[PDB]
């Protein structure tokens, strides 16, 4: 599995560009795709989503009216067309995949990055964290503002980790069960409004920023992030 | 347990008569079809006769017509075969087989020793 | 054919050594087991409409 | 009017019970010879409602002008649905191999939707053309009062007569093929003996060209006279015969009706 | 010569010993208890989408997912709660006779007239399903291959032989012999240590997995045996034959206990099943129906109707909440 | 519900794919090939396969030769095929009763009561030589051969002895007697005469399938 993207550069206001996401290593015709942008001084932000078979398209509300998303299955390429951009679009974009069926695991693989320099449920994180010596116990909590139990026993809350100088990785989905390829030393549980993360053993390769994300209403809202030092 | 027996063999000279019997047990004798099967000394098994549940569906093969008779006695669970005026070419071993399922019109009896519902066989000698 | 007949006799000789018990002591256990687990059978007693996952 | 009141109830009653059975048979099966029988029961139902509504509900201004555009339109769909069933039978006996791979659910739906569009302009357009219109309109509403005899006689000439020759032309060929097959069967049966059906094949086609030829002719018969009430009753009486012919000779339709009538 | 005499003497001794320990009967002991009455079930869900007849099915370990096999070469996985398709796997060979579902839910197996029971993988990185292994060591057709663990499987074929396989290397380890006709079905004990089989010579046998030798033999039927199932306790089983009868056997006594036979029934039986508490018995017939028997009294109570062709499979969920049936008109139904 | 709408979308896509598959499935005719050894069955053509096409129509033919001699269990699978092809060798008198017995057993089954049979009488050239030379008789095996007369429907080949014609038609009538004794009007039998070097063998199957379909359709409209 590999995702490579090309484009970006220097753009004067009022211009236009085109970004391409090339996929190779998996069945491209059965996955939905997402575009996620990260500000140089803020957290992640949702941009657009295109379904499988191009039967459903959604946008956030800060771009709608000047952005367009498209796909081409035979050539395994993903496109993003932009109209004249403002000075607030200076961000690095990512390419994500997700498959939806009973028991699946969305938001598993991420992209690389692209520099394009030009010039509602609220989730709150806070207090950061002091440096932690290895071998201790650390707890992280993310606070919501609405119930996340959809009358069928499913609570939607995902956790991500971004190592410095790399791309985010998936840790826990649906706040109960751990993802594949991750050590079994991570556990998470909480109530319908309060949530927490528990790590038992601290190592030298577990430093970064942790985010809490919710998937219940399609305008997706991320957290603020907590930095762990040494 | 399905069990069948054979009796009525011996050594005879060309020209004579003898009888055979097939005693049945372990199942309802009135709901099945009965056959007689004979294998030559060196050849495969060959169909010979037939009889049905009611009593009148008799059939034979071409080479025994006018010389063989087959009848059944439902009140004692016994099968019979009356054969007379034999020929030196009849020096084979006879068996008493039944069709697998009841209330049927077809069965598959002639099989290379892999059929479970069959008798042990009896020896008949006519040349000398 | 002699090889096949020998095996049948050999197999039958091992079945004469099995220890057996009376029928009543085997039927009583079945009756007790049936009577001791009747209340965990949703098929015998109709499932209430409030607790039925199938509708 | 007492005859019509009994007539109005029978037409709706016998046809709604048939459409319930057919729609159930359609779900647990997949055949194109069942979508057309649903149209036939629907087309017969709207005829009974329209004729009953005009007389009994509004028994003694363009009140009657449009209401003579609904009855005529419904009667058109009755004939054309019959002509779609016959053309379906013919292709599956004359072209056995090229019919299996081209007939599908999508094609069947296209024929039904396009059927209703044509029948709409048959009844709605005529009042638009000044030529086919009478004058001196008044009370005592009747079919001839609000319509021109030229319209109804001309339509029969172009509509019924060319379509008539097609119906007969198909069932005469199917007798030639059917009679040939029965001869071969008899010949082989004579060799397993030495060691009727065709008179039913010709006594069935007699019924079908007997319950269809007399559908439109009596209405034209009074048309030639008018340029009566007994002829009209027999004309819509045929609409009661059609449910029996095409929805009782089928073994599957009868059995479900038998098994789900009152048990 | 002497072999037949010794066999007859041994059989006589065995029959005398078996008949010398029968004092009473099951029907003579359960006379005082009250009956269950009448039970009525109505269909809740109907699943459609198959193209031809259905030959096999199997329930998942969480009683939510099930798999089905059809003669047109398809293998679909359903979601019984909401009637949603999760997968659809095309087969290389059109003729398929059996299917299975792994206890952990990671593998699926199937086989048929090609003398091979294949293995499929459900959780892959590429996002599709693919064949993981193929096993070929049999001669006749294959009628049942049933999982035992994530690394081993038990198979019975039509050449009068059963075997124990090894998925990792593909080589068989143990072979069971002793039948005369072809084997048609098998069932596994709850502890996965013993299993039984039924052949077309009107007999059944009890095997031992660890050693590979026959333990004891029960014979009380008169025709071929089509289905077999195990008691929930683990000390009895029931069989269905081609002469319209069912019988119940006791392991500790080597004798049959009761016969479930009724008049005006002249059709064979294709499948049997039990309940969670072992109080009811379900059997599928060739006359397009399904019957519910009373285990402790042997009298009919309730009928299941609605199929328009013969039934070929029948199962019960692990928690005992639903029954699923499949027939030759390619429709699956769930009763409750 | 955002994660449960996509499941419905995926299910709809799978159903639309199965809809495409059905049209391809329904437009192909399958055939089953039976017979015995020493019959030249392979010359005409645990599972075999053979695909041939005539006039842009596809046919599938199967041959089973990987199992034992017990065929009362795996024969229930082929209960929805178009037709059954039966091949016999009409040049050896010692093995005719077996062919007759298997034909009767197949015809009188309960799960195959709506399937037609196409009959091939292979090896028609050796029989003529055997009768012309003369070393074995037929009344010794079949006593009824001494009172047989050629029917008026005979169409002898140009320049052939009438004894060969009588022998051929007696053998055909032997099968026809069984064929026309237990038929309720749901299936029939199509005899044929086949040589070892004939080149027109697919056209006969084509015509027989066309006739089968036409008769089946005509029967249910009360026209036959
Ligand atoms: C189910 O039996 C019925 O009650 N028959 C129905 C029926 O109502 N039949 C009538 C329909 C009819 C009425 C008036 C004029 C034209 C048609 C007749 O057609 C009955 N018909 C008789 C009939 C046929 C044609 C005509 C006719 C048609 C055109 C012109 C002149 N006469 C008149 C009467 N019956 C037979 O010919 C029977 N034949 C038979 O072997 O009976 C001993 C059938 C039935 C087996 C076909 C249907 C056949 C339509 C289902």
């Amino acid at each position: 599995v590999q995702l490579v993207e090309s484009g970006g550069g220097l753009v004067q206001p009022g211009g236009s560009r085109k970004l391409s996401c090339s996929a190779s290593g998996f069945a491209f015709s059965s996955f939905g795709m997402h575009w996620v942008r990260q500000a140089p001084e803020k957290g992640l932000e949702w941009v657009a989503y295109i379904s499988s078979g191009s039967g459903t398209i959604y946008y956030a509300d800060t771009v709608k009216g000047r952005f367009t998303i498209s796909r081409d299955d035979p050539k395994n390429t993903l496109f993003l067309q932009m109209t004249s951009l403002r000075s607030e679009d200076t961000a690095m974009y990512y390419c994500v995949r997700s498959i939806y069926y009973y028991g699946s695991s969305p938001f598993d693989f991420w992209g690389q990055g692209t520099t394009l320099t030009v010039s509602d449920i609220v989730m709150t994180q806070a207090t950061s964290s002091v440096p932690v010596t290895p071998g201790e116990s650390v707890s992280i909590s993310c606070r919501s503002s609405k119930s996340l139990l959809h009358s069928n026993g499913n609570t939607y809350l995902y956790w991500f980790l971004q190592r410095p100088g790399q791309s985010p990785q998936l840790l826990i989905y649906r706040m109960s069960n751990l993802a594949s390829g991750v050590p079994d030393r991570f556990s998470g549980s909480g109530s319908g409004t309060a949530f927490t993360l528990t790590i038992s053993r601290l190592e030298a390769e577990d430093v970064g920023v942790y985010y809490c994300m919710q998937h219940l209403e399609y305008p997706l809202t991320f957290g603020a992030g907590t930095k762990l030092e040494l | 347990q399905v069990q069948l027996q054979e009796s009525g063999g011996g050594l005879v000279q060309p020209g004579g008569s003898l009888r055979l019997s097939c005693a049945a047990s372990g199942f309802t004798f009135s709901n099945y079809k009965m056959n007689w099967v004979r294998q030559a000394p060196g050849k495969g098994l060959e169909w010979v006769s037939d009889i049905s549940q009611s009593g009148a569906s008799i059939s034979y093969t071409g080479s025994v017509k006018g010389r063989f008779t087959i009848s059944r006695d439902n009140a004692k669970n016994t099968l019979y075969l009356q054969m007379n005026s034999l020929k030196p070419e009849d020096t084979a071993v006879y068996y008493c087989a039944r069709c697998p399922a009841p209330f049927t019109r077809d069965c598959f009896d002639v099989t290379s020793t892999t059929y479970a519902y069959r008798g042990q066989g009896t020896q008949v000698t006519v040349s000398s | 054919s002699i090889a096949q007949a020998r095996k049948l006799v050999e197999q039958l000789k091992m079945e004469a050594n099995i220890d057996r018990i009376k029928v009543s002591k085997a039927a009583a256990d079945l009756m007790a087991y049936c009577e001791a687990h009747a209340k965990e059978d949703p098929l015998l007693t109709p499932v209430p409409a409030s607790e039925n996952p199938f509708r | 009017g007492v005859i019509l009141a009994v007539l109005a109830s029978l037409i709706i009653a016998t046809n709604t019970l048939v459409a319930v059975a057919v729609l159930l048979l359609i779900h647990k099966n997949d055949g194109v010879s069942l979508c057309f029988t649903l149209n036939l029961a629907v087309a017969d139902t709207l005829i009974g409602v329209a004729i009953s509504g005009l007389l009994t509900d509004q028994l003694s201004k363009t009140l009657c002008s449009l209401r003579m555009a609904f009855v005529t339109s419904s009667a058109a769909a009755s004939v054309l649905t019959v002509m779609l069933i016959t053309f379906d039978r013919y292709l599956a006996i004359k072209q056995p191999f090229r019919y299996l791979k081209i007939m599908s659910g999508f094609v069947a739906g296209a024929c039904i939707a396009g059927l209703w569009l044509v029948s709409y302009l048959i009844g709605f357009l005529p009042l638009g053309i000044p030529m086919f219109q009478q004058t001196a309109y008044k009370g005592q509403c009747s079919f001839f009062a609000v319509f021109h005899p030229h319209f109804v006689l001309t339509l029969s000439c172009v509509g019924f007569f060319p379509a008539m020759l097609l119906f007969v032309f198909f069932y005469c060929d199917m007798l030639k093929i059917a009679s040939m097959h029965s001869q071969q069967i008899r010949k082989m049966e004579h060799a397993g003996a030495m060691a009727p059906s065709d008179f039913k094949a010709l006594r069935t086609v007699s019924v079908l060209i007997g319950s269809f030829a007399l559908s439109w002719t009596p209405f034209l018969i009074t048309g030639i006279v008018q340029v009566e009430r007994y002829l009209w009753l027999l004309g819509v009486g045929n609409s009661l015969l059609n449910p029996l012919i095409y929805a009782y000779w089928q073994k599957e339709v009868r059995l479900q009706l038998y098994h789900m009538a009152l048990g | 010569d002497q072999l037949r005499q010794e066999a007859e003497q041994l059989k006589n001794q065995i029959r005398d010993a078996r008949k010398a320990c029968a004092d009473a009967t099951l029907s003579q002991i359960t006379n005082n208890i009250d009956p269950v009455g009448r039970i009525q079930m109505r269909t809740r869900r109907t699943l459609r989408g198959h193209l031809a007849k259905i030959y096999a099915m199997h329930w998942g370990t969480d009683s939510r997912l099930l798999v089905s096999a059809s003669q047109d070469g398809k293998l679909i996985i359903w979601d019984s709660y909401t009637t949603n398709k999760v997968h659809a796997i095309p087969l290389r060979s059109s003729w398929v006779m059996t299917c299975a579902y792994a206890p952990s839910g990671n593998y699926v197996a199937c086989g048929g007239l090609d003398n091979i029971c294949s293995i499929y993988n459900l959780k892959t990185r590429e996002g599709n399903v693919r064949v993981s292994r193929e096993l070929a060591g049999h001669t006749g057709y294959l009628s049942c291959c049933r999982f035992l663990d994530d690394n081993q499987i038990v198979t019975s074929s039509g050449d009068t032989t059963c075997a124990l396989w090894d998925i990792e290397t593909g080589q068989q380890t143990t072979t069971f012999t002793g039948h005369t006709g072809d084997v048609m079905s098998l069932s596994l004990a709850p502890d996965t240590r013993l299993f039984v089989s039924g052949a077309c010579d009107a007999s059944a046998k009890l095997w031992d997995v660890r050693e590979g030798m026959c333990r004891q033999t029960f014979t009380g039927h008169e025709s071929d045996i089509n289905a077999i199932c195990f008691f929930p306790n683990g000390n009895a089983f029931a069989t269905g034959s081609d002469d319209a009868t069912c019988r119940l056997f006791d392991l500790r006594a080597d004798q049959e206990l009761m016969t479930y036979s009724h008049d005006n029934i002249i059709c064979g039986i294709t499948s049997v099943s039990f309940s969670k508490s072992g109080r009811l018995l379900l059997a599928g017939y060739d006359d397009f129906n399904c019957n519910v028997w009373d285990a402790l009294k042997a009298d009919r109570a309730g009928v299941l109707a609605g199929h328009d062709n013969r039934v070929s499979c029948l199962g019960v969920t692990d928690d005992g909440m639903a029954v699923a049936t499949g027939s030759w008109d390619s429709f699956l139904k769930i009763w409750n | 519900s955002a994660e449960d709408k996509a499941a419905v979308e995926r299910s709809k896509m799978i159903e639309k794919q199965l809809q495409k598959d059905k049209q391809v499935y329904r437009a192909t005719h399958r055939l089953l090939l039976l017979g015995a050894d020493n019959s030249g069955k392979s010359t005409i053509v645990g599972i075999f396969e053979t695909k041939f096409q005539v006039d842009k129509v596809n046919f599938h033919m199967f041959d089973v030769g990987g199992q034992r001699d017990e065929r009362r269990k795996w024969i229930q699978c082929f209960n929805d095929v178009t037709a059954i092809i039966f091949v016999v060798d009409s040049s050896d008198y010692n093995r005719l009763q077996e062919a007759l017995n298997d034909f009767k057993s197949i015809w009188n089954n309960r799960w195959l009561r709506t399937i037609s049979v196409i009959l091939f009488l292979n090896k028609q050239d050796l029989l003529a030589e055997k009768v012309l030379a003369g070393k074995s008789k037929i009344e010794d095996y079949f006593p009824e051969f001494a009172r047989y007369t050629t029917p008026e429907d005979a169409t002898p080949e140009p320049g052939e002895d009438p004894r060969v014609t009588r022998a051929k038609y007696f053998i055909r009538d032997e099968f026809l007697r069984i064929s026309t004794a237990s038929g309720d009007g749901r299936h029939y039998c199509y005899p044929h005469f086949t040589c070892a070097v004939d080149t027109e063998n697919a056209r006969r199957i084509f015509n027989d399938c066309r006739d089968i379909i036409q008769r089946m359709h005509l029967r249910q409209y009360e026209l036959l």
Side-chain angles (χ1 to χ4, degrees), chain B residues 37-112 115-119 121-127:
Chain B
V37 176
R38 154 202 67 168
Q39 99 162 294
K43 313 349 171 193
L45 275 75
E46 205 226 328
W47 189 72
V48 168
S49 297
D50 193 315
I51 188 159
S52 177
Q53 332 158 48
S54 300
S57 290
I58 316 180
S59 302
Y60 303 87
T61 188
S63 164
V64 313
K65 283 183 182 179
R67 297 185 292 124
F68 279 29
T69 309
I70 166 162
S71 63
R72 74 190 296 171
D73 197 352
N74 251 297
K76 209 167 210 153
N77 315 326
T78 310
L79 203 70
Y80 289 127
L81 181 74
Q82 174 75 240
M83 53 173 189
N84 44 57
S85 56
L86 279 84
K87 298 177 183 178
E89 70 181 3
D90 302 330
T91 325
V93 172
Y94 294 81
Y95 303 96
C96 174
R98 92 164 164 88
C99 309
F103 310 133
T104 65
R105 218 193 280 150
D106 55 307
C107 37
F108 314 77
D109 317 278
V110 181
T111 308
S112 167
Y115 199 66
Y117 327 119
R118 212 156 71 203
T122 184
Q123 181 63 254
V124 174
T125 303
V126 185
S127 66

Side-chain angles (χ1 to χ4, degrees), chain D residues 203 206-207 210 241 245 249:
Chain D
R203 264 161 171 211
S206 154
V207 156
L241 261 53
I245 294 169
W249 267 339

Side-chain angles (χ1 to χ4, degrees), chain C residues 8-24 26-27:
Chain C
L8 186 58
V9 161
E10 175 63 32
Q11 178 64 31
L12 267 192
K13 285 180 182 177
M14 301 325 108
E15 198 160 349
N17 301 317
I18 304 172
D19 203 78
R20 318 193 141 82
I21 61 171
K22 293 178 179 179
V23 178
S24 68

Side-chain angles (χ1 to χ4, degrees), chain E residues 306-307 309-324:
Chain E
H307 272 302
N309 209 344
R310 77 194 288 263
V311 306
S312 56
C313 34
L314 203 142
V316 166
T317 73
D318 292 76
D319 45 16
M321 201 95 68
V323 189

